[PDB]
Amino acid sequence: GEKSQAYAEWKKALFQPADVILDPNTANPILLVSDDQRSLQRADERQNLPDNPERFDWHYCVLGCKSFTSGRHYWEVEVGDRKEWHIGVCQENVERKCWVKMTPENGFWTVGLTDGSKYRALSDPRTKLTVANPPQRVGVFLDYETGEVSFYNAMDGSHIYTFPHTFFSGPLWPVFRILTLEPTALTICPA
Amino acid sequence: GEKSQAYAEWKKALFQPADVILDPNTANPILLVSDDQRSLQRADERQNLPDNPERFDWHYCVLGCKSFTSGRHYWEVEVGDRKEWHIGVCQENVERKCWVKMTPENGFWTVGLTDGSKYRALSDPRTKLTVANPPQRVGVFLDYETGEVSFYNAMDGSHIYTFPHTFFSGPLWPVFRILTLEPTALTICPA
Numbered sequence A, B: 001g002e003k004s005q006a007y008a009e010w011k012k013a014l015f016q017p018a019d020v021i022l023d024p025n026t027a028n029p030i031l032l033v034s035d036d037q038r039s040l041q042r043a044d045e046r047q048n049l050p051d052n053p054e055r056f057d058w059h060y061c062v063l064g065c066k067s068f069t070s071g072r073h074y075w076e077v078e079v080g081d082r083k084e085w086h087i088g089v090c091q092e093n094v095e096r097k098c099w100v101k102m103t104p105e106n107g108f109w110t111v112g113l114t115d116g117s118k119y120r121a122l123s124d125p126r127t128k129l130t131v132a133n134p135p136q137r138v139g140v141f142l143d144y145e146t147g148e149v150s151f152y153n154a155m156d157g158s159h160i161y162t163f164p165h166t167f168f169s170g171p172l173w174p175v176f177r178i179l180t181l182e183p184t185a186l187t188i189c190p191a
């Protein structure tokens, strides 16, 4: 209880709770956004969607509906028993159509999981993470002004990863990515 | 380059720069504190020194000359190629005379290196770290109010470790521990 309590108090001293919903107009055509816009699944094949400019056509990504240009913000994501996921932030100006490698140099700050047990930060090169207990819920923490993106196990307060401090260019968006077709959705925790 | 600049801007924006000097009165008798109080080495054998109450008698530890009871503070330590070292903060009330495990529950928040290649956080139990580039200079970051102790590579800005947010009791001192005889001293970088 003490580690959860200190995690709650820290998030109150410093970070504004963001109420993040998924924008279906940004979602790759293989993704399904839930009607309440909190949950994400994958289809067996691309669905028939317009190719509007905001849509990720290659990467299996979706954005939030609000961006950040300043300030300290957090949100929490129920990854549950998923075997695969990536979450974090990206710049408004990322390449959405052509492939680009999802790295900080290309405007992406994400961590995640592959093959049930391989936790990685998508630094370049990728950082192999050591996680003592697989997180069911992950907190994403942004400080725009200091260039900080960090990740915690939201249930026990343990730290997962902090990217090197950087300089952002333009607005940042919450980003979510799933590659697999598996029973458990990715779900955003309401603020 | 940019990662060093962003690390510099972050530490300047949010943390008070501590000018840390070693207190030889606190040092375990096997330690040698330099005349300028910036450098720490180990002697071959325990020196004959008085067992005054403030002196560490069991652990091979020394404190700084100033504690923190509030605020955000940072300092940097040149570890160079030294194969063994642990650094961080501890509570004024730690057990200095008798055997105790150096853990957060016992008032110590430290990380470091064993046998040239084994990075650990001194959590209970110890957390094995994976560090892609061995740091030569380590930044120690304290936020008293949010219970935060984190550690960075002070040359490239890469993150090393963040303890779970906690609650501190009383003053925190910079603490330094070396177990081995090695050519390379630990040296505190001035503010």
Ligand SMILES: C=C(C)CCOP(=O)(O)OP(=O)(O)O
Pocket: B058, B059, B060, B101, B102, B122, B126, B179
């Ligand atoms: C033996 C002493 C007094 C120094 C190291 O203590 P431990 O052997 O308990 O090891 P750490 O895990 O604290 O390095």
